[PDB]
């Protein structure tokens, strides 16, 4: 009756979600999204990375050429997957610095092997063992050559192999440690002596040590495995009087992005960029709590099992019953916008969404989602993060480096989400305040602020008039005479 | 006279404290609290962690069973404390990879030892030395067995010990390096030869080397110490023709949270969660500058010696002498609240605190104190961070890892406190501004803003009227006629 | 005509720069500065750090005393620079743990050597080789002493050297591995046997191994290099029957801030605190993308090639043509301040800068520049970050530590600049808003807000009157009668 009411407000939802900001440990917002990936399918997807499932073979078994690993010859991988069931089924061996040879072959990503014609004049080649059956016959590691006496002579070997290629050569070789003095004479025709394998830049001398070790697959002897990398222009020289498990050639050694992972997860026909030992995981989220061991474009590992990013404003219940604006009060009935107007005039009570303010909030929230979602970075060969044996110093360092990293990332994640959520609350509160201020400024002296997010408009203000305010075309001068008379009247 | 004044304000204190924010390198606030712990009592509290004071013994001396360490037999610890006065008082020895054996025993946290009956048929057991006195008699390491010839024979040993337990066994053994060829024959009846200690998964061969070393406690000979871990289902095999310092059994090897620390701090009868080499430190603060070496629930080490967290608003002097509000002006006389009202009316000049605004600020400050104070996390065995010898590569890495970590934490601490302090200044400024806005809205057209944080109320406004404003029950309509007449009058 | 207009505004520039904030991926500001150093001069400045250019010598070659390195005797450095052209020109050698000896000498920063008189009674000293020419004559490493038989006898050596100094001694020594059994007898008069070098705290036994290696500078033999540090109160004991390459004395070993760097950059006569392999770089900026390898007071390495810090407000085009204020509108014509006033009155249209607001913004921006610019911290000897050989485990860890560090710093840099830029936008927006509010408060009921950052002043307001508003001396009471009549009139 001679006046109207115009309220500014924002939506509210019946099912809000709790997030953390800098101001509040817990504040309910209209919507949020999870930033920590905590589930895996449980399978390793065979795309888009080239997976090599080791099955019963370790990488080192496949390198040496254990008969059950013959199918692996010359294969390449992005990721070699080693299974806990894996077992050796040839001559018992050890590798001093096993972890390093495993790592360097894993990182190279290839088992490509080129045979070479070493001059083994004066000895017997191709020694075999019942401990290493191939197609039901006594055999040996495919890539190694067990040399033994010929006619009870084993003349001193002094054998050369130049690298005349433009790439490096990786040589794998070994030293046989016989169980008894009888086996030594029976195999090499003389007492044990050192083996020296050298290049222009390196030398390795190894002493065969006769003696029974506990039997493994009925064998009390051992082979110790060594490696030598030979550069272009360098030469491999092998010097021995027995006990030599000779190379048959060299492996290519490449550089690139290959690695190795211990997992029992099945390999599936599917496509996922991020692999963990638990299986492939989606990489849309910036963080994950599935496993510290990862390969590919992966979220970063954090300790938190959930971090919720606000994707809407503060959620505020509608106060119980005269229309009312945003002051301590959301509008559950506003479903076509985030901010808007309610009015009361001669023609009834109405509501309209404000598109500009709503879109400004939505655009900014989508902006931060764009920075955080689907933006993971790739990592490849790293360090080991689980250990089956006690080792002391080096392992203490590996563990401390990883613990240190995870705590720093977990801190960055916690702070980032608290800061972003505070900013979301601030920017959404700000759109509400700006809408209110813009309206106040249009109305000039024709309205008063009622203190509840509403204006009392001191003139008849029909539907078109209200629309003019909402649309930014209200001309205050048209109504000012009427309004000033109504406002400043002695009652 | 026909009008009143109502001012909004906030407290101020005579003794404020300087903090850093994002906006200001130095800003005075009413109160602050220290976040960096920089003092220790100087003693290690014997509760709640199980402390083992090594006194004159290193952990390795206590392991081997140096006579002065007999009291340590079978003890466990959370933290083994090694003293700089510690010294060896038995046969001179070295441990290749001493640091790793020390670390693995420290982390295991137990000296539990189980004797076993090795079959040493054909040799003399229990060799003793004047360099290792026990109760004034020639003796030897309690856990080791010095075998020597019997009737001038030392038959080849080939001795086995199966692990039929469900847990791992740690074996400690040694190789004696005699000073002279005479001692070799006198002890073992024959020239030196290798010792091989093996399992199904490992082998270690060690060569005794005869020769004088510089005398230590009058002994030119040495013992070199080795270790072997034997898994359930595996077997220890010892193969020797002399120079064997044999094990008498095995140590349990456990996993858990135990460690070792070098400190000369006395042990006290007190209770503290965080231990450093300088002594236990309180763990209420999130950061500390006492020592990078810590054990237990400890603040994080940072380089800063002080970081002050604001726990009150900006501290603003009261301007010198008509009442005045918060614009460039604090109220030292307001002692029962942080924010409030001063008024001038017919009945005098009065002050009242506003509880709501005051409590809102206090609650939020207490919130952040709750996140930061008494919330430290536990760490246990880590890496070494001080070194008595020059070593090169591995030590360079250990040092770089720790330096890297400390610089990253020191940065996080600096940023966190600057951000929190900025937020405290913002939230306390905001409570003042909201109080002023709420008041302005109640007053409607009955008052004007004087620009100094005060309103000129254009009607008679007695004590009850002022109280109604403060209490949120002022009805502007009652006074509007009077106020509009006073405001809009030709003077 | 009976009224005036007063607009508040801020400057704008024709050539703004894009930065990133928390709110906007891209926002144009009036000015910015680069925080990532991405160029080097290409030369290493010889000041203020003491540089030692290795030229054709590695540090280890200079240590041993290869003839071409004689000029390096006893020199010290802060930074030893090793060139890729460097080559050895003496007897072929290897150093087991080369990387550690290189590191410990590099970090010590001195080649100071003190000769000592070892008692080599019974052997020939000063062996020479055609592979190691000095001044066209057969020679040998300057710091080593090749002992050979005397009259076809080489009596067992058992030689002592006490450390009676107050500092540690570094001894470098070697073992000769002859190409053939003939050379062994010709040099040492008997078959090879072990060398033992010991102290009270350490022992090292090395076995000479006869055999041809591939010829290097026509030599099939090798020398293997070892080192021993002897403490005050300890004694060096050398025990040998041949193959000993003896020390002539000891190196001082110091602690301090020295290091070593691989670079081919020329050394220049200039002064720069920060050295990288690409050359010295300026250290004004907090970050750099030139090289992860640094020495001295250096910006921190990050992955980003640019991070722009805002040093001015948001840059907003001037809207096209009645004066207008800051609402969606900058003033390109304001060149003597950042914020100001434009007015329209009886005497024309004028502009004046507001010094206070302008200086408040400038001071705060200079504050953050002061924290970020010219504030780098020094680092010295670190870890290696590039590798010429494949090694496996230890190298994997070194690489992972550095990758981890760089990713954490790159994250901190990205967040810091986004936060600072958001704060700059906020503080500059705030100065504009405060200026507007201060003005509004002075005007009281004499003006209305037109919604475009301008006031309509409802009285005649001449140049002095406008000046009084700008200067903060406007007395609203003088004009209130006139203004209220103009505002509240029936039109
Ligand atoms: C609460 O917040 C969420 C993030 O803003 C939001 O999830 C987003 O929803 C959209 C639409 O469903 C998804 O986008 C999809 O839309 C196109 C349409 O053309 C599809 O073709 C695409 O496949 C695309 O996936 C987003 O993926 C999704 N974003 C995230 C991070 O989950 C929810 O909708 C919001 N919930 C409520 C109740 O409002
Ligand atoms: C040193 O001690 C070792 C452990 O006692 C011993 O190894 C054991 O040797 C026996 C006999 O060869 C093996 O027993 C085998 O006996 C028959 C022989 O026909 C076989 O058919 C069976 O397979 C049966 O296993 C043990 O297996 C073996 N024990 C271990 C742990 O390896 C060495 O022989 C001894 N060495 C010397 C040089 O005497
Ligand atoms: C300045 O800021 C400090 C942090 O807000 C504040 O210190 C806090 O003071 C309280 C009360 O003295 C301490 O809490 C104690 O109160 C209960 C009462 O039931 C005692 O029973 C407990 O023992 C408890 O310790 C807090 O410990 C203390 N907090 C911190 C972090 O120090 C100061 O009081 C403030 N100073 C001024 C002048 O206002
Ligand atoms: C190789 O050289 C070593 C150093 O010269 C030498 O060690 C020294 O041996 C002497 C004589 O045994 C010790 O001197 C001791 O002399 C009397 C003997 O009755 C003792 O009562 C005293 O305690 C006195 O110390 C030295 O202590 C000892 N020096 C060191 C540094 O250990 C070796 O004996 C030599 N080795 C051979 C095989 O000849
Ligand atoms: C845009 O932002 C830049 C940072 O605010 C600013 O650069 C700064 O400019 C000053 C003045 O040219 C330089 O300071 C120099 O001034 C004294 C005068 O006594 C000289 O004697 C000194 O040598 C000193 O270098 C600053 O060095 C410089 N700061 C930085 C970080 O670059 C630009 O001027 C600004 N550009 C525009 C167009 O406004
Ligand atoms: C073991 O095999 C080695 C490689 O075949 C061999 O080394 C080679 O020795 C020959 C002959 O001494 C060297 O050839 C040199 O021949 C004349 C001799 O007058 C010299 O003037 C030339 O400089 C020419 O180089 C090879 O250089 C050398 N090859 C390598 C790679 O070092 C060893 O001699 C053999 N060892 C034994 C004990 O027989
Ligand atoms: C390396 O090869 C050389 C031969 O090229 C070996 O030297 C011969 O060894 C035999 C058997 O011990 C001796 O009878 C000959 O007199 C040696 N020949 C020469 C020319 O010296 C040498 O033993 C091999 N080395 C090793 C460690 O196996
Ligand atoms: C390991 O033990 C075996 C015996 O079980 C040793 O072999 C005997 O050694 C003696 C003395 O050298 C010889 O006379 C015998 O002929 C060997 N017996 C057999 C069955 O071969 C062997 O020496 C021990 N090994 C070590 C390194 O000590
Ligand atoms: C270390 O020095 C001692 C002498 O001080 C050497 O022992 C002598 O060695 C010779 C030659 O082998 C023997 O004939 C003598 O009988 C030994 N003398 C004594 C007193 O035992 C010993 O060989 C040297 N050790 C090494 C590894 O070179
Ligand atoms: C692996 O070994 C198991 C156990 O011997 C065997 O049954 C299985 O068939 C093997 N798998 C492959 C792929 O060879
Ligand atoms: C993944 O495997 C690790 C290692 O066994 C386990 O700790 C973790 O709970 C697993 N996570 C999920 C989501 O399966
Ligand atoms: C736009 O403005 C006009 C008045 O100029 C108003 O009547 C109309 O309803 C407005 N349209 C909308 C969609 O708000
Ligand atoms: C430790 O050794 C010192 C020096 O011999 C001795 O006086 C002290 O009593 C010893 N302390 C213990 C606890 O055995
Ligand atoms: C603690 O001990 C360390 C190491 O000696 C020393 O640097 C530091 O000053 C000590 N700190 C305190 C508070 O005693
Ligand atoms: C509460 O409001 C009444 C007026 O309705 C006022 O007079 C009274 O003083 C107020 N009480 C307080 C404690 O401010
Ligand atoms: C380094 O070696 C090269 C190649 O022999 C030589 O020409 C040059 O003069 C040498 N430089 C110095 C400084 O000795
Ligand atoms: C510096 O050298 C490194 C290593 O070769 C190279 O990657 C980088 O591009 C160089 N940077 C500059 C600015 O020259
Ligand atoms: C200062 O204030 C006076 C009026 O009191 C005004 O007329 C004068 O122009 C002002 N000066 C400036 C520099 O603004
Ligand atoms: C092993 O070498 C022999 C030469 O003795 C060669 O002819 C043969 O092809 C090889 N044997 C096998 C089974 O590959
Ligand atoms: C050492 O072993 C003997 C067997 O020779 C045993 O009887 C005795 O208990 C042991 N000696 C000591 C002092 O413990
Ligand atoms: C090497 O030692 C001899 C003693 O045999 C000494 O006189 C001479 O100075 C030394 N020779 C050289 C070339 O320095």
Query: Could you say which ligand is closest to the alpha carbon of residue B470?
Result: 15
Please give the full DSSP string across C400-437, using - where no structure is assigned. Answer: HHHHHHHHHHHHHHHHHHHHHHHHHHHHHHHHHHHHHH
Q: C408: closest CA among A256, A377, B197?
A: A377
Q: Pick the residue of A191, A393, A410 with the most B CBs within 10 A to test the interface with B by mutation.
A: A393
- Residue corresponding to tokens 């933290």: B79
Q: Which residues surround ligand 13 with Cβ inside 6 Å?
A: B 55-56
Distances from the Cα of C55 to the Cα of A162, C59, C72, C106, C264, angstroms: 31, 10, 10, 16, 9
Residue A131: partners with Cβ closer than 8 Å, 6 or more residues away: A90, A91, A92, A217, A218, A219
Which of B186-204 are b and which e, b meaning 16 or more Cβ less than 10 Å from the residue's Cβ?
Answer: ebbbeebebbbbbbbebbe
Q: List the one residue out of C174, C178, C205, C173 whose CA is nearest residue C190.
A: C178
Strand pairing report for A4-10 and A454-457: antiparallel
Name the 3-class secondary structure at C267: strand
The three-state secondary structure class of A420 is helix
Distance CA B59, CA B53 (A): 10
Contact status, residue C139 vs residue C133, Cβ threshold 8 Å: yes
The answer to whether the beta carbons of residues A75 and A105 sit under 8 Å apart is: no
What determination technique applies here? X-ray
Taking contacts as CB-CB distances below 8 angstroms, the residues of chain B near A486 are none
B-C contacts at Cβ under 8 angstroms:
96
Nearest by Cα to B352 from B338, B370, B366, B367: B338
Mark yes or no for CB contact B391/C196 under 8 Å: no
The answer to whether the beta carbons of residues B21 and B425 sit under 8 Å apart is: yes
How far is it, in rounded angstroms, from Cα B470 to Cα B460?
A: 16
Could you state, in order of their start, the residue ranges of all structural domains in chain C? 1-49+266-491, 50-265
Distances (CA, A) of C276 to C39, C158, C295, C385: 11, 48, 7, 12
C349: which residues sit within 8 A by CB, 6+ positions away? Answer: C323, C342, C343
What is the helix (H) or strand (E) element at residue C106, kind and residue range? Answer: helix C98-108
Identify the residue among A104, A234, A392 best suited for mutation to test binding to C, counting C beta carbons within 10 A and taking the highest.
A104
Count the Cβ atoms, other than its own, within 10 Å of residue B473: 9
Integer-rounded Cα radius of gyration of chain B: 38
Q: Which residues pair with B159 in a beta bridge?
A: B238
Q: Which DSSP helix (H) or strand (E) runs through C102?
A: helix C98-108
The values of phi and psi at residue B298, to 5°, are -120, 145
Please tell me the distance from the alpha carbon of residue B263 to that of residue B84, in angstroms, as a whole number: 7
Q: What is the DSSP letter of A71?
A: G
Query: Ligand 2 centroid to A62 CA: how many Å?
Result: 30
Looking at the CA of A54, name the nearest ligand.
10
Q: CA-CA distance, A138 to A179, in Å (whole number)?
A: 19
Chain B: give the shortest CA distance to residue C133, in Å.
32
Write out chain B residues lying below 8 Å of A490, CB-based. 481, 484-485
Is there an atom of ligand 3 within 6 Å of B18 CB? Answer: no
Q: Do B393 and C103 touch (CB under 8 A)?
A: yes
CA of B178 to the centre of ligand 4 (A): 14
C68 three-state secondary structure: helix
Cβ–Cβ < 8 Å for B57, B66: yes
Rounded Cα distance between C114 and C481, Å, is: 100
Q: A273 — phi, psi (to 5°)?
A: -70, -30
Chain-chain contact of B104 with A391 (C-beta, under 8 angstroms): yes
Atom of ligand 17 nearest to the CA of C38: 13
**Residue A398 in tokens:** 């590996």
What are the two backbone dihedrals, phi and then psi, of residue A9, each rounded to the nearest 5 degrees? -155, 180
* Residue A348: both structure tokens together: 């009834």
- Number of other residues whose CB lies within 10 A of the CB of residue B152: 10
Quick one: which of A245, A261, A485 has its CA closest to A385?
Answer: A261
Measured CA to CA, the distance from residue C469 to residue C472 in angstroms comes to 5
Any CB–CB contact under 8 A between C401 and chain A?
A: yes
- DSSP assignment, residue A238? E
Three-class secondary structure assignment of chain B: CCCEEEEEEEECCCCCEEECCCCCCCEEECCEEECEECCCCCCEEEECCCEEECCCCCHHHHHHCCHHHHHHCCCECCEEEECCCCCCCCCCEECCCHHHHHHHHHHHCECCEEECCCCCCCCECCCCEEEEEECCEEECCCCEEECECECCECCCEEEEEECCCCCCEEEEEEEEECCCHHHHHHHHCCCCCCEEEECCCCEEEECCCCCCCCCECCECCEEEEEEEEECCCCEEEEEECCCEEEECEEEECCCCCCEEEECCCCEEEEECCEEECCEEECCCCCEECCCCCCEEEECEECCCCCCEEECCCECCCCCCCCCCCCCCCCECCCCCCCEEEEEEECCEEEEEECHHHHHHHHHHHHHHHHHHCCCCEEECCCCCCCCCCCCCHHHHHHHHHHHHHHHHHHHHHHHHHHHHHHHHHHHHHHHHHHHHHHHHHHHHHHEEECCCCEEEECCCCCHHHHHHHHCCCCCHHHHHHHHHHHHCCCC
B242 and B177 in contact (C-beta within 8 Å)? no
Collect all residues of chain A within an 8 Å Cβ-Cβ radius of residue C449.
441, 444
> If you count them, how many residues does chain B have?
491
Ligand nearest to the CA of C354: 18
**By three-state DSSP, how is residue A365 classified?**
helix
Nearest by CB: A408 against B397, B408, B480: B408
Long-range contacts of B427-434 (CB under 8 A, 24+ apart): B427/A23, B427/B361, B427/B364, B428/B10, B428/B312, B428/B313, B428/B314, B428/B338, B428/B361, B429/B313, B429/B314, B431/B338, B431/B339, B431/B357, B431/B358, B431/B360, B431/B361, B432/B8, B432/B10, B432/B313, B432/B326, B432/B339, B432/B357, B434/B357
The CA-to-CA distance between both ends of chain C, in Å, stands at: 15
Ligand 20 close to Cβ of residue B182 (< 6 A)? no
> How many Cβ atoms from other residues are within 10 Å of residue C336's Cβ?
11
Q: Is residue C144 within 8 Å of C216, Cβ to Cβ? A: no
The ligand 19 atom at the shortest distance from the C-alpha of residue A126 is: 1
CB B218, CB B131: distance < 8 Å: yes
DSSP-assigned states of every residue in A146-175 = E-B-BTTB-PPEEEEEE--SSS-EEEEEEE
- Does C467 sit in the ligand 6 pocket, CB within 6 Å? no
- Dig out the tokens for C89 from the structure: 């020109």
Residues of A in contact with C483 (CB under 8 A): none
The answer to whether the beta carbons of residues C335 and C272 sit under 8 Å apart is: no
Sequence-distant (≥ 6) Cβ neighbours of residue C50 within 8 angstroms: C76, C77, C78, C79
Instruction: Name the β-bridge partners of B223.
Output: B93, B176
C424, C314 in Cβ contact below 8 A?
A: no
CB-facing half-sphere around the CA of A50: CA atoms within 13 A:
10
| Residue found under tokens 């060569």 | B207
**Residues, chain A, total?**
491
The answer to whether the Cβ–Cβ distance between C393 and A100 falls below 8 Å is yes
Residues with CB under 6 A from ligand 12: A 464, 467-468, 470-471, 473
Ligand nearest the Cα atom of residue A92: 2
Report CB contact under 8 Å: A398, C394.
Answer: no
Two tokens, residue C270: 């200039």
One DSSP character per residue, A426-485 reads HHHHHHHHHHHHHHHHHHGGGEEE-SSSEEEE-S---HHHHHHHHTT---HHHHHHHHHH
3-class SS at C262?
strand
Q: What is the DSSP string of A371-405?
A: HHSS--EEE-S------SS---HHHHHHHHHHHHH
| Residue B383 at interface with chain C, using a CB cutoff of 8 Å | no
Biggest CA–CA distance in chain B, Å, is 133
Residues A445/A412, Cβ–Cβ less than 8 Å: no
CA-to-CA distance for C384 and C60, rounded, in angstroms?
Answer: 16
Domains A1-49+266-491 and A50-265 share a fold: no
Helix/strand/coil for A336? coil
Cα(B476)–Cα(C380) distance, rounded to whole angstroms? 72
Using the mean position of ligand 10's atoms as its centre, give its distance from the Cα of residue A162 in Å.
40
Instruction: Enumerate the β-bridge partners of residue B175.
Output: B224, B244
Contact across the interface for A22 and B419, Cβ inside 8 Å: yes
| Distance between CA atoms of residues B417 and B452, nearest Å | 32
Q: Are C204 and C227 in contact (CB under 8 A)?
A: no
Query: Given the structure tokens 């490449």, which residue do they identify?
Result: A254
Which residue in C215, C214, C197 sits closest to C206, CA to CA? Answer: C197
Q: What's the fold here for domain B1-49+266-491?
A: Hemagglutinin Ectodomain; Chain B (3.90.20)
Structure tokens at C286: 């907090």
Give residues 91 to 130 of B whose Cβ lies within 8 Å of A: 97, 99-104, 107
Paired sense of beta strands A287-288 and A36-37, if any:
parallel
Is residue A249 helix, strand or coil? Answer: strand
Q: Report the alpha-carbon distance of residue A384 to residue C396 in Å, rounded.
A: 9
Cα separation, B121 vs B119, in Å, equals 6
Distance CA C487, CA C429 (A): 31
In the numeric block, the tokens 């300088």 are attached to B278
- Tell me, in angstroms, the distance from the centre of ligand 19 to residue B128's CA: 58
A132-169: b or e for each residue (b if 16 or more CB lie within 10 Å)? Answer: bebeeeebbbbbbbbbbbeeeebeebeeebebeeeebb
Please report which helix (H) or strand (E) contains residue C238, including its range: strand C235-240
CA distance C176 to chain A (A): 13
Token pair for C276: 């990288």
* Secondary structure class of A133 (helix, strand, coil): strand
Name the residue at shortest CA distance from atom 11 of ligand 20.
B126
Contact (CB, 8 A) for A184 and A210: yes
How many angstroms separate the CA atoms of C29 and C421, rounded?
10
β-pairing verdict for C308-310 and C274-276: unpaired
CB C386 within 8 A of CB B386: no
Answer for the pair A454, A478: CB distance below 8 angstroms, yes or no: no
Contacts of C418 in chain A (CB under 8 A): none
- Closest C-chain CA to A162: C214
Contact B7, B324 (CB under 8 A): yes
Look at residues C464, C455, C467 and name the one whose alpha carbon lies nearest to residue C3.
Answer: C455
Torsion angle of the four alpha carbons B98, B102, B104, B110, in this order, in degrees rounded to the nearest 10: 140
CA distances C312 to A49, B117, B418, C35, Å, are: 47, 83, 22, 15
Tokens of C29: 């500001």
Query: Residue C396: which of A103, A200, A239 has the nearest Cβ?
Result: A103
Give the strand pairing for A51-53 and A79-82: parallel
Rounded Cα distance between B79 and B119, Å, is 36
The answer to whether C222 and C174 have CB atoms below 8 angstroms apart is no
Q: Map residue A64 onto helix, strand or coil.
A: helix
Kindly state whether C388 is in contact with chain A, defined as any CB-CB distance less than 8 angstroms.
no
Cβ atoms within 10 Å of A299's Cβ, excluding its own: 24
Q: Which of B365, B336, B367, B366 is nearest to B352 (CA)?
A: B336
Q: Are strands A244-247 and A169-177 parallel, antiparallel or unpaired?
A: antiparallel
Q: In Å, what resolution does this model reach? A: 1.9
Q: Tell me how far apart the alpha carbons of residues C395 and B340 are, in angstroms, rounded to a whole number.
A: 65
Q: Which ligand is nearest to the CA of A127?
A: 19
Q: With contacts defined as CB-CB under 8 Å, which chain B residues touch C235?
A: 214
Element (H, E) at C443: helix C393-443
For residues A302 and A413, is the Cβ–Cβ distance under 8 A? yes
Q: Is A7 within 8 Å of A332 (Cβ atoms)?
A: no
CB < 8 Å to B211, chain C: 196, 198, 239
Relative to beta strand C300-301, strand B17-19 is unpaired
Burial call A63-92: b when 16+ CB within 10 Å, e when fewer = bbbbbbbeebeeebbbbbbbbeebebebbb
Candidates C393, C426, C440, C454, partner chain A, best to mutate (most A CBs within 10 A): C393
Q: Is C401–A401 a contact, with Cβ atoms under 8 angstroms apart?
A: yes
Sheet with B295-298, edge to edge strand ranges: B279-281, B274-276, B295-298, B377-379
H helices, E strands: number in chain A: 7, 34
State yes or no: cis peptide before A48, omega within 30 of 0.
Answer: yes
- CATH 1.10.10.10 is held by the domain B50-265: no
Q: Which two tokens stand for residue C346?
A: 């009886």
Strand duo C377-379 + C295-298: pairing: antiparallel
Q: Which residues of B touch A391 (CB under 8 A)?
A: 100, 104
Which of C158, C160, C383 is the closest to B400 by Cβ? C383
Rounded Cα distance between A396 and B103, Å, is 8
Cis peptide before B109 (omega within 30 of 0): no
Decide if C56 touches B, using CB distance below 8 A.
no
**Which member of B25, B177, B393 has the closest CB to residue C367?**
B25
* Residue of A400, A421, A425, A452 to mutate, interface with B, max B Cβ within 10 Å: A400
Q: How far is the alpha carbon of B392 from chain C, nearest alpha carbon, in Å?
A: 4
C237 with B216: Cβ contact below 8 A: no
> What DSSP string describes C352-404?
EE-HHHHHHHHHHHHHHHHHHSS--EEE-S------SS---HHHHHHHHHHHH
């Amino acid at each position: 009756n001679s006046t109207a009411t115009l309220c500014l407000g924002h939506h509210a939802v019946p099912n809000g979600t709790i997030v953390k900001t800098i101001t509040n440990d817990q504040i309910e917002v209209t919507n949020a999204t999870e930033l920590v990936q905590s589930s895996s399918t449980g399978g390793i997807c065979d795309s888009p990375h080239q997976i090599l499932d080791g099955e019963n073979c370790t990488l080192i078994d496949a390198l040496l050429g254990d008969p059950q690993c013959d199918g692996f010859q010359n294969k390449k991988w992005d990721l070699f997957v080693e299974r806990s069931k894996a077992y050796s089924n040839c001559y018992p061996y050890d590798v001093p610095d096993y972890a390093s040879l495993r790592s360097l072959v894993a990182s190279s990503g290839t088992l490509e092997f080129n045979n070479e014609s070493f001059n083994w004049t004066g000895v017997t080649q191709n020694g075999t063992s019942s401990a290493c059956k191939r197609r039901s016959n006594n055999s040996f590691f495919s890539r190694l050559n067990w040399l033994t006496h010929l006619k009870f002579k084993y003349p001193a070997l002094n054998v050369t192999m130049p690298n005349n290629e433009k790439f490096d050569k990786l040589y794998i070789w070994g030293v046989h440690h016989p169980g008894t003095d009888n086996d030594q004479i029976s195999l090499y025709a003389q007492a044990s002596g050192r083996i020296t394998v050298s290049t222009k830049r390196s030398q390795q001398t190894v002493i065969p040590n006769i003696g029974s070790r506990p039997r493994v697959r009925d064998i009390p002897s051992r082979i110790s495995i060594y490696w030598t990398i030979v550069k272009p222009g360098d030469i491999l020289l092998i010097n021995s009087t027995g006990n030599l498990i000779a190379p048959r050639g060299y492996f290519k050694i490449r550089s690139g992005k290959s690695s190795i992972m211990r997992s029992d997860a099945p390999i599936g026909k599917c496509n996922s960029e991020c692999i963990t030992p638990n299986g492939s995981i989606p990489n849309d989220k910036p963080f994950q709590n599935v496993n510290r061991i990862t390969y590919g474009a992966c979220p970063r590992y954090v300790k938190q099992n959930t971090l919720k990013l606000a994707t809407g404003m503060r959620n505020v219940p509608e106060k119980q019953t005269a229309i009312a604006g945003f002051i301590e009060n959301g509008w559950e009935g506003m479903v076509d916008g985030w901010y808007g107007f309610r009015h009361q005039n001669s023609e009834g009570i109405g509501q309209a969404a404000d598109l500009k303010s709503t879109q400004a909030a939505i655009n900014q929230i989508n902006g931060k989602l764009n920075r955080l979602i689907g933006k993971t970075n790739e990592k490849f060969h790293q360090i080991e993060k689980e250990f089956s044996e006690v080792e002391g110093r080096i392992q203490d360092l590996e563990k401390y480096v990883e613990d240190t990293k995870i705590d720093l990332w977990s801190y960055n994640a916690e702070l980032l989400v608290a800061l972003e959520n505070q900013h979301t609350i601030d920017l959404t509160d700000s759109e509400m305040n700006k809408l209110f201020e813009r309206t106040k400024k249009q109305l000039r002296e024709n309205a008063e602020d009622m203190g509840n997010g509403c204006f009392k408009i001191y003139h008849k203000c029909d539907n078109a008039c209200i629309g003019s305010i909402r649309n930014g075309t209200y001309d205050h001068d048209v109504y000012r005479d009427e309004a000033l008379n109504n406002r400043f009247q002695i009652k």
